[PDB]
Paper text:
An understudied class of proteins in phosphotyrosine signaling, the receptor protein tyrosine phosphatases (RPTPs), are a family of single-pass transmembrane proteins whose architecture include an extracellular domain resembling those of cell adhesion molecules (CAMs) and intracellular single or tandem tyrosine phosphatase domains. In vertebrates, this diversity is typified by the leukocyte common antigen related (Lar) and its two homologs RPTPδ/PTPRD and RPTPσ/PTPRS, which form the type IIa family of RPTPs. The ectodomains of Lar-RPTPs resemble immunoglobulin (Ig)-superfamily CAMs and include three Ig-like domains followed by four to nine fibronectin type III (FN) repeats. Surprisingly, we uncovered a tripeptide, Lys-Gly-Asp (KGD), in the Dlar FN5 domain that is similar to the RGD motif in FN10 and is conserved in the Lar-RPTP homologs across species.
Numbering used by the authors: 708 to 733, 741 to 751, 755 to 810
Write the structure that this text describes.
């Protein structure tokens, strides 16, 4: 099974979306996982399926909101290792 995607970058495009790009693990499908950020409670994260591309615009997000972005390759047992999280805030505030 593959390791984590390499050289991940993420930057907001507008108040509702983020352009995520990466290089393959050291694979035709990936997941992008986006989690909105005193007891460690979290709302439901977003997941995006990506096929046959090494970048993707994740959309439908909340304005003025911090998101943790991770990418994973898809494998026979589920996701491979996730890239180290990138925290980015959408504009709109
Ligand atoms: Zn996944
Ligand atoms: Zn999937």
């Amino acid at each position: 099974v593959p390791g984590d995607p390499q050289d991940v970058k993420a930057t907001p495009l507008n108040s509702t979306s983020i352009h995520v790009s990466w290089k393959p693990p050291l694979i035709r499908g990936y997941h992008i996982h986006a989690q909105e950020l005193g007891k460690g409670f979290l709302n439901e994260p977003f997941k995006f399926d990506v096929v046959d591309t090494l970048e993707f615009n994740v959309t439908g997000l909340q304005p003025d909101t911090k998101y943790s972005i991770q990418v994973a390759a898809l494998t026979r047992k589920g996701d491979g290792d996730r890239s180290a999280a990138i925290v980015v805030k959408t504009p709109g505030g």
